[PDB]
Point group: D2
Chain length 197, copies 4
């Protein structure tokens, strides 16, 4: 019933993917969805310099995560891991861990690169952290038919939606990438409501 | 409701574990639980010359997997991957993958090693394959309190149950190892019924 | 000084990538390079049916691997792992392992998908096995400039060269993919000769 | 010739390990070995209120890494990843990455956990980031005979040395753990000189 899209984005790609994930989840009758971001970690001046890019979404507290039946995580990659900011966040979830606050909750993840390299490693290495919390890990497999389209460069994997930002940052999530993101949101919100309800 | 425990074992360590997993699964009302092994790959002469171990469990067909709501997979490690016989078996699931036969079904893995090294990577890189079928991956987290006991050597991870066989093979699964295994069976069977049901 | 390109290919993509890897290695003055394949695992009739595709390269024995200063491994993916055939092969390397035959030798890997999904997981999960043998693992990082080209669909990652076969198998390794493959071969053969010499 | 031991430690477990790694590295003639820590990320008030542990080691700058031939990285796990402070630090290596400053340099990782769970994944997902800089990743395999001893609880994997801290933090690195650590330092220092030299 309650789905949190929790994300970090520096230049807006993950933010755009997050809104798409939220759209899809919102299609599920019975699903309350909220979008939030993790605290920034680099100093604000440097940030801004930098820089990229102010966000509407409120910053989440670690404690809030207990209020949700499913959490969908988005990070850009940093050399094939989650971003330091998302890492710093998850590192504050000890209290939650000790009480088993997130145990058995649905977790899914989406990311952004690149150039594309690391997009898989970023997701799967995020899953690891989620597993330590005993979260139920939900990949998207091959239901989104766009994953078979190799006629255009295209993010997205069976592990979760992804987007390709361009080495430059100038690319925007394509319709096909967004379509997969939307599918991710709808699927996990559906499974959440099936659970949940 | 239908939970399959599908395993490979050469010397019976995983076999003992599978039984424990099935034991746990059977504590759940409404869970039909069945235990099957994958085909041995080495010619019967070499197996006997190195062995045993002869197994009671029926051998599974790839097609069968479609008939279950949840599948719990066990393998000894081979240098930090699933065994070649588990790999060979899963390589036969192309038909299933193409029709979406395992999509959304619950999956969980347990393994056995050495010595211990590679026990995590075995579970984690098995998850990868399950994610390609779009299976919902279920880790065990730290519900099983035995995971905190560092006073004796002990298999078991938040990713799934493990056992430590010894360089010899001479170790047997300890009470704590089997306790975690039972837990893994009990939990995914419960989820399976909650899904499913 | 001695570089083995060890591969499995069913429909020729990895075979084509392997020859490219070999080309690149062959550019290194002082580098003896040989190309071999691992035994087929599926029955020959079925194979052929199937089927795809007869190879010039001789099939390697596990023992031979000790004769080399560097081994470059190629597999197609099977749901984000190495192929069962490559797995079966590596599973025969126990004797080598026990003597430390491959300890400290250079290892690198390249793969084929898809559609693209699993290309990273396939490489990194192969690295695991190589690490159990204490092989020195060599990724290619971002030296091959083609990795920045997002204007055409393109395999290859910092983990190792890859190729995209098309869901169909109809794609052929593109010039850019081959160029990265060639770079992989030249780089690890270079490092081999630096070692070696 | 120049080997950097670069680590994060909150309670000193990794710190003790780093010293052991440096100890091992120093047995190699021609190896200049230096030990540095990454910046603490939590404000000094919270650190003190939870701590210590105050560290003798100089704090490293991202830029410095360019000055070394080999870098050995240590981190406590955070739910199966590198720590957020190690992540934050490596996220500052963009300049290095862009100029190819760490390309081809030797890399190796060691960690610390719990409890044990996530010790492999921590090393393995650190490798991912190193591979993006095109570092030559060096696992330890099974040269260190202590890796066979399952008669006492014991950190250490073929991917790199580990120590088990206890749920308490109250465990100290055991003689065998440190022995593996020393080995890891000794081996990568030797390779570094062989490269380098
Ligand atoms: C230091 C750091 C490391 C990065 N490493 C990679 C990586 O090696 N592979 C890649 O494709 N992109 C890499 N990038 C790019 C980011 O993943 C990319 O800019 C991000 O997807 C942008 O998404 P956002 O707008 O949501 O912040 C890196 C960026 C930074 C700042
Ligand atoms: C080819 C092969 C590779 C192996 N690699 C490892 C490994 O690197 N790490 C480890 O701890 N044990 C390793 N082992 C030990 C097996 O994982 C062990 O015998 C198995 O867990 C026993 O399970 P079973 O009795 O159910 O067959 C290996 C064994 C074989 C034959
Ligand atoms: C059963 C099996 C599983 C496969 N799984 C995947 C995977 O899910 N992702 C993907 O992109 N391709 C997958 N494929 C495609 C193979 O990786 C692909 O056909 C191979 O790269 C062809 O290379 P080759 O000509 O060297 O054999 C799979 C193929 C088989 C037969
Ligand atoms: C936020 C956080 C997450 C942690 N996650 C794990 C983990 O899941 N598994 C584990 O065994 N220990 C975990 N621990 C324990 C730390 O890894 C342990 O305290 C560390 O290894 C001690 O090393 P140090 O003394 O060098 O700081 C965690 C600790 C913190 C604070």
């Amino acid at each position: 019933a309650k789905v949190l899209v929790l994300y970090y984005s520096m230049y807006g790609h993950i933010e755009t993917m997050a809104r798409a994930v939220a759209e899809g989840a919102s299609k599920v009758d019975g699903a309350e969805v909220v979008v939030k971001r993790v605290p920034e970690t680099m100093p604000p001046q440097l940030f801004e310099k930098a820089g990229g890019k102010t966000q509407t979404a409120p910053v989440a507290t670690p404690q809030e995560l207990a209020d949700y039946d499913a959490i969908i995580f988005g990070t850009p990659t940093r050399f094939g891991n989650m971003s330091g900011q998302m890492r710093t966040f998850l590192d504050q979830t000890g209290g939650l861990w000790a009480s088993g606050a997130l145990y058995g909750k649905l977790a899914s993840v989406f990311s952004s690169t690149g150039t594309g390299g690391g997009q898989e490693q970023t997701i799967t290495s995020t899953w690891t952290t989620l597993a330590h919390h005993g979260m139920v890990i939900v990949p998207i497999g091959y239901a989104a038919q766009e994953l078979f389209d190799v006629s255009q460069v295209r993010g997205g994997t069976p592990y979760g939606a992804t987007t390709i930002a361009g080495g430059d940052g100038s690319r925007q999530p394509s319709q096909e990438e967004l379509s997969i993101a939307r599918y991710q949101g709808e699927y996990v919100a559906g499974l959440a409501v099936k659970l949940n309800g």
